[PDB]
Design a protein around this ligand. Structure first.
Ligand SMILES: COc1cc(OC)c2c(=O)[nH]c(-c3cc(C)c(OCCO)c(C)c3)nc2c1
Ligand code: NA
Length: 127
């Protein structure tokens, strides 16, 4: 069994900027979720090999996780807040698509997503 390569976190071909919204995404949004008691399954790519989930990457063709997001923020990968917000939504959506209501991982995702929603509701106006 094999995992795919992780999503990229560096690409000199990609355009990027450092903005007040992206700073908020790191300092407020990512930090809040990262510290949460239920963050840990989401802090790195799903290891479908060790977890014995051989169909994971058959169903999830756009993997995303907060370790990748953290690196993207820290390594100034993004052009705008929407690109980052999309990554968070992909991560949550992947969990809901793969799993079933009431599963522990879904409950965990839902807790993180509640906080995500509240933080992004106060994303500052661009400077
Ligand atoms: C340890 O990190 C994870 C991260 C995950 O997603 C971010 C998942 C995930 O999306 N599903 C599961 C997973 C694993 C098993 C063995 C489960 O029991 C029944 C088989 O379907 C369930 C319901 C979910 N484990 C993750 C572990
Ligand atoms: Na993943």
């Amino acid at each position: 069994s094999m995992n795919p390569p992780p999503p990229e976190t560096s690409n000199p071909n990609k355009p990027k900027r450092q903005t007040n919204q992206l700073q908020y995404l790191l300092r407020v949004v990512l930090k809040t979720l990262w510290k949460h008691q239920f963050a840990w399954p989401f802090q790195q790519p799903v290891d479908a090999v060790k977890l014995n989930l051989p169909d994971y990457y058959k169903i999830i063709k756009t993997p995303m996780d907060m370790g990748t997001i953290k690196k993207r923020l820290e390594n100034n990968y993004y052009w705008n807040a929407q690109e980052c917000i999309q990554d968070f939504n992909t991560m949550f959506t992947n969990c809901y698509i793969y799993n079933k209501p009431g599963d522990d991982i879904v409950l965990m995702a839902e807790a993180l997503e509640k906080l995500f929603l509240q933080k992004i509701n106060e994303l500052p106006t661009e400077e």
